[PDB]
Amino acid sequence: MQLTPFLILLRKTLEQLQEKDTGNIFSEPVPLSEVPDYLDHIKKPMDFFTMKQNLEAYRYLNFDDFEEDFNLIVSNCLKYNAKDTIFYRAAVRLREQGGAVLRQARRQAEKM
Ligand X SMILES: O=c1[nH]ccc2ccccc12
Stretch that binds ligand X, among 5-13, 22-30, 50-58, 59-67 (CB under 6 A): 22-30
Q: How far apart are CA 78 and CA 76, in angstroms?
A: 6
Q: Is 30 in the site for ligand X (CB under 6 A)?
A: yes
Is 77 a binder of ligand X (CB under 6 A)? yes
Q: Cα–Cα distance between 25 and 91 in angstroms, integer? A: 9
Number of residues that bind ligand X (CB under 6 A): 9
Distance CA 32, CA 28 (A): 11
Question: Which residue, 44 or 103, has its beta carbon nearer to ligand X?
Answer: 44
Find, among 10, 18, 15, 17, the residue nearest to 106 by Cα.
Answer: 10
Q: In the complex with ligand X, which residue's Cβ is closer, 81 or 108?
A: 81
Binding site for ligand X (CB under 6 A): 25-26, 30, 35, 76-77, 80-81, 87
